[PDB]
């Protein structure tokens, strides 16, 4: 039941989503490098820096994004990056990875200077995502919805963000219905994951301050996108 309009929108989204890659030079380290809180931190920093670049590119290609005011573009990226990265991590942790990558990446994140107070909820959210059995189209669209959120701090023209978001929600709603007609509230449940992504924003500012007081340093890109 997608309309041709919706099909065009979906195709633009998936083309942009599918370019999302983490280089082998980074992911090889999961297995190859030593295991210390220090090296685990460096690995994660390398992953985060790469993923922020990937996300900036995805965001630039979202429908209408280019037509938004330049400062509002920046406010959307800053406001949504953490949530997009949690959702991407949820996708990664419920996906088949090369041999050994899932288990050892989990061990490294659990011994990277992140308190158990934030580890536990993080892996709990990854589990709730796994249980939804999301398709690639659901991940892509939900990510795009997170990025084009009108409530982020410092967005001036909220109304125009809100308009770009609307047809993504429409497509996502028809898709959920078509794919999981036996869980007719699957769309609502995805929106409920949006609410829960908001908690990871708070958790993340705290993780960053803990990392900083244990004298970990971030790349220049990360310092910008997350306000140091």
């Amino acid at each position: 039941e997608l309309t041709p309009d919706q099909q065009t929108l979906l195709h633009f989204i998936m083309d942009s989503y599918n370019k999302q890659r983490m280089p082998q030079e980074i992911t090889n380290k999961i297995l190859k490098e030593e295991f210390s809180a220090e090296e685990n931190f460096l690995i994660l920093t390398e992953m985060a820096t790469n993923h922020v670049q990937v996300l900036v590119e995805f965001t630039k290609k979202l429908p209408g994004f280019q037509t938004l005011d330049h400062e509002d573009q920046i406010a959307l990226l800053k406001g949504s990056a953490v949530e997009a990265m949690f959702l991407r991590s949820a996708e990664i942790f419920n996906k088949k990875l090369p041999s050994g990558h899932s288990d050892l990446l989990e061990e490294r994140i659990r011994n990277s200077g992140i308190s158990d107070e934030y580890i536990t909820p993080m892996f709990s959210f990854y589990k709730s995502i796994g249980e939804l059995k999301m398709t690639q189209e659901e991940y892509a669209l939900l990510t795009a919805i997170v990025i084009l959120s009108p409530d982020r701090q410092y967005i001036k023209d909220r109304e125009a963000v809100e308009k770009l978001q609307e047809p993504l929600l429409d497509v996502l709603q028809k898709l959920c219905k078509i794919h999981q007609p036996e869980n007719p509230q699957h769309f609502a449940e995805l929106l409920g994951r949006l609410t829960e992504l908001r908690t990871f924003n708070h958790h993340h500012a705290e993780m960053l301050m803990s990392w900083r007081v244990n004298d970990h340093k971030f790349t220049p890109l990360l310092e910008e996108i997350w306000d140091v």
């Binding site: 670049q53 900036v56 590119e57 920046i74």
Partner: peptide, 10 residues
């Protein structure tokens, strides 16, 4: 800040 601005016009 500098970097993000640049990546957005690339």
């Amino acid at each position: 800040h500098k970097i993000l601005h640049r990546l957005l016009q690339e």
